[PDB]
Design a protein around this ligand. Structure first.
Ligand SMILES: CCCCCCCC/C=C\CCCCCCCC(=O)OC[C@H](O)CO
Ligand SMILES: CCCCCCCC/C=C\CCCCCCCC(=O)OC[C@H](O)CO
Ligand SMILES: CCCCCCCC/C=C\CCCCCCCC(=O)OC[C@H](O)CO
Ligand SMILES: CCCCCCCC/C=C\CCCCCCCC(=O)OC[C@H](O)CO
Ligand SMILES: CCCCCCCC/C=C\CCCCCCCC(=O)OC[C@H](O)CO
Ligand SMILES: CCCCCCCC/C=C\CCCCCCCC(=O)OC[C@H](O)CO
Ligand SMILES: CCCCCCCC/C=C\CCCCCCCC(=O)OC[C@H](O)CO
Ligand SMILES: CCCCCCCC/C=C\CCCCCCCC(=O)OC[C@H](O)CO
Ligand SMILES: CCCCCCCC/C=C\CCCCCCCC(=O)OC[C@H](O)CO
Ligand SMILES: CCCCCCCC/C=C\CCCCCCCC(=O)OC[C@H](O)CO
Ligand SMILES: CCCCCCCC/C=C\CCCCCCCC(=O)OC[C@H](O)CO
Ligand SMILES: CCCCCCCC/C=C\CCCCCCCC(=O)OC[C@H](O)CO
Ligand SMILES: CCCCCCCC/C=C\CCCCCCCC(=O)OC[C@H](O)CO
Ligand SMILES: CCCCCCCC/C=C\CCCCCCCC(=O)OC[C@H](O)CO
Ligand SMILES: CCCCCCCC/C=C\CCCCCCCC(=O)OC[C@H](O)CO
Ligand SMILES: CCCCCCCC/C=C\CCCCCCCC(=O)OC[C@H](O)CO
Length: 506
């Protein structure tokens, strides 16, 4: 270092700290101003840099953000990776590094085309470039758009913007507001402060708009069974039997009382084709008392090619949902977690027969669009675990007659970490975006009911064997976001980009 903050070594360190500051914005800590402070740090530290230096600054900021926020992936790698301790740490640092590239990319491109510090760079160029940059991290090599700052404000002042343009609009606006604040602090000029406050305060009245209308007549008692069943060391018929006894014995008392019962992802730990007698018998018991069950299961279905394809599945039983193996009322998982449910670069099969022994097992993908689940005259658009954080995918599957949004997930991995909470926060956003109640049941994890505005209706603690029963009411409204999607944001992002690129090219 030489003089003040003008020298690079200090800025990389400061970028590391402000990146880490962004973690506090998300679900466990729930401090939304940490987003603006984090973004101001990223915006201000990239001022007056060479594109390469800014890209380095950006990379560090991402490393502080992703290293502190995503480090919970270690507990899954350590358990099932079969790897030494130091390698697992190496893999986690590698993941945070890979994610920080896009942050470094954002800063590198921002500095080259918009080097001078001007409101154009912070308020126009950055939010559009950030919109593109955050997209790449989310679209490249099967996703992982985790820790988007829009979710940090589910309870905050800007929540009214979400039902209109979606969560990615809050990402766009937060980058915008932070830029004006960072510009105001660096230039010692109050004019961007006024604009930033105005830009920040104007969306506040939008939280009082209700784009949905409720429906007392369709009010139902719903039950979500959270079995605390641990992850399996050894699979025998005894553990399977122990698992079904846990769920059925909790399900049987509520069959008469509650209209809909939900079981978490892969609740039945056996293939669907084996359990046909248990399933058909369970359907009868439910239909007689006038209730319906929604459960996750593993389905290996014979392909036309006569080989076997395995799907992560949701199936429907009970009244209004007669169970059939060929029944079209079911959900198969589309987007598969990269190293958990599938092996990337599966072409490595050639060395496999000699030398080592590698996993050949991989799941299969369902259709990108699947019809909503129908049970008890209720339409549920469903998503399994990770899928709920994909906002565009959820909205495309959402059909206006949909009564509830449904997520079943197994958070048993990551337990006691901040991951399940981060996961839970993003799920709330889908409810506010679409103005529908969300029913989320986990094996162990956050099992709760969320209202149309993102309000938490009812919740049960983690790591317990419990049933969450309460009354939930449907809503028939249509938000602007449900109709348009994020098309308006991209048009705005094009307009901002088109203008900012045209100004940079002179
Ligand atoms: C491998 C991932 C690279 C790890 C990124 C950390 C870079 C860093 O923070 O080094 C700055 C240092 O504090 C100097 O000021
Ligand atoms: C330079 C400006 C730095 C500002 C930092 C804001 C930090 C706010 C810290 C608020 C902490 C909230 C919290 O501690 O929640 C923790 C969790 O619930 C239990 O571990
Ligand atoms: C500055 C924050 C930089 C933090 C980046 C260091 C990564 C932390 C890490 O990988 O540790 C795994 C964690 O301990 C498993 O729970
Ligand atoms: C302000 C600088 C301090 C901000 C650092 C926050 C890091 C944090 O939130 O710690 C969570 C931890 O990574 C959970 O594994
Ligand atoms: C390179 C990454 C290789 C390690 C990834 C393997 C892994 O973590 O597996 C998780 C497990 O399958 C979760 O169910
Ligand atoms: C380029 C390389 C970038 C970093 C890749 C390194 C490690 C990623 C492996 C960690 C992710 C695998 C964990 C598996 C998992 O999380 O499974 C959970 C469950 O199956 C679904 O919800
Ligand atoms: C122009 C846009 C480029 C964006 C590059 C994309 C990601 C870079 C993120 C990784 C950080 C790159 C570090 C570069 C570096 O270390 O620079 C060496 C030094 O500046 C030489 O004199
Ligand atoms: C230049 C890249 C432009 C890519 C736009 C494609 C797109 O909008 O993808 C939708 C995405 O899933 C929504 O976040
Ligand atoms: C140049 C275009 C960049 C390629 C991304 C466009 C794209 O893949 O579209 C997103 C798709 O709709 C969602 O997966
Ligand atoms: C939070 C950061 C807000 C920074 C505002 C700094 C500012 O307004 O500068 C004073 C103004 O120039 C009066 O002379
Ligand atoms: C999604 C939400 C999209 C909202 C976009 C709405 C208005 C854009 C106005 C942006 C222009 C505001 C910058 C003006 C400014 O910063 O001026 C500072 C001062 O005058 C310098 O000396
Ligand atoms: C909506 C409210 C906008 C108020 C803007 C404002 O208060 O700016 C004053 C500034 O902080 C004084 O230097
Ligand atoms: C290569 C793309 C990076 C994929 C990393 C896998 C990952 O992020 O796992 C998260 C976990 O699966 C959440 O359920
Ligand atoms: C600064 C932030 C400014 C936010 C703009 C505020 C309101 C615009 C929304 C006006 C309503 C647009 C019509 C959409 C609509 O009415 O959706 C219902 C329809 O049934 C679906 O097909
Ligand atoms: C520069 C990229 C401009 C391409 C914009 C068109 C585009 O990629 O849109 C894809 C479409 O949304 C797919 O569903
Ligand atoms: C290298 C210079 C860096 C420039 C940095 C800023 C450039 C932003 C410009 C255009 C963004 C693409 C605009 C694409 C508009 C169409 C996207 C779209 O329509 O896709 C949405 C649809 O809903 C999908 O499902």
């Amino acid at each position: 270092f030489a003089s003040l903050i003008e020298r690079q070594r200090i800025r990389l360190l400061l970028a590391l700290l402000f990146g880490a500051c962004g973690t506090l914005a998300f679900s466990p800590y729930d401090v939304w101003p940490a987003a603006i402070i984090s973004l101001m740090g990223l915006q201000a530290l990239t001022f007056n840099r060479r594109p390469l230096q800014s890209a380095a600054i950006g990379f560090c900021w991402g490393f502080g953000l992703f290293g502190s926020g995503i480090n919970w992936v270690y507990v899954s790698i350590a358990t099932f990776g079969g790897m030494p301790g130091p390698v697992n740490i190496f893999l986690v640092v590698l993941l945070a590094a890979y994610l920080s590239l896009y942050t470094g990319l954002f800063a590198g491109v921002l500095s080259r085309l918009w080097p001078k510090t001007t409101w154009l760079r912070v308020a126009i160029a950055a939010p559009a470039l950030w919109q593109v940059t955050e997209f790449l991290r989310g679209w490249v090599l099967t996703g992982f758009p985790w820790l988007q700052f829009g979710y940090s404000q589910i309870d905050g002042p800007l929540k009214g913007l979400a039902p209109i343009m979606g969560v990615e609009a809050i990402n766009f606006l937060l980058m915008m507001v932070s830029g004006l604040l960072a510009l105001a602090l660096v230039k010692r000029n109050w004019r961007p402060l006024v604009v930033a406050v105005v830009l920040f305060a104007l969306p506040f009245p939008l939280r009082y708009i209700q784009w949905f209308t409720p429906q007392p007549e369709k009010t139902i008692q719903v039950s979500m069974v959270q079995g605390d069943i641990p992850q399996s060391l050894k699979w025998d018929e005894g553990q399977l039997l122990n698992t079904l006894k846990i769920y059925y014995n909790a399900t049987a008392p509520l069959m008469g009382k509650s209209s809909l019962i939900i079981w978490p992802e892969s609740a039945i730990t056996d293939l669907e084709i084996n359990q046909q007698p248990f399933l058909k018998a369970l359907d009868g018991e439910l239909r007689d008392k006038g209730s319906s069950l929604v459960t996750g299961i593993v389905d290996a279905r014979l392909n036309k090619q006569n080989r076997y394809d395995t799907y992560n599945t949701i199936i429907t039983l009970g009244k209004g949902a007669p169970y059939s193996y060929e029944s079209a009322d079911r959900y198969n998982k589309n987007h598969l977690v990269p190293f958990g449910e599938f092996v990337p670069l599966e072409s490595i099969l050639r060395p496999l027969a000699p030398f080592f022994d590698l996993p050949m097992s991989s799941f299969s993908r369902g259709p990108y669009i699947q019809p909503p689940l129908s049970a008890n005259g209720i339409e549920l658009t469903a998503a399994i675990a990770y899928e709920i954080i994909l906002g565009e995918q959820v909205r495309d599957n959402f059909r206006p007659d949909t009564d509830y949004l449904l997520t079943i997930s197994n958070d048993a991995w990551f337990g006691k970490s901040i991951g399940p909470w981060q996961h839970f926060q993003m799920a709330r956003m889908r409810a506010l975006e679409l103005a529908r109640p969300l029913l989320r049941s986990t094996n162990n994890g956050i099992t709760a009911v969320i209202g149309p505005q993102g309000e938490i209706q009812a919740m049960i603690p983690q790591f317990t064997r419990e049933v969450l029963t309460t009354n939930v009411t449907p809503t028939t409204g249509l938000t602007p976001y449900a109709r348009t999607g994020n098309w308006p944001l991209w048009v705005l992002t094009a307009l901002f980009g088109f203008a900012a690129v045209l100004m940079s090219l002179r």
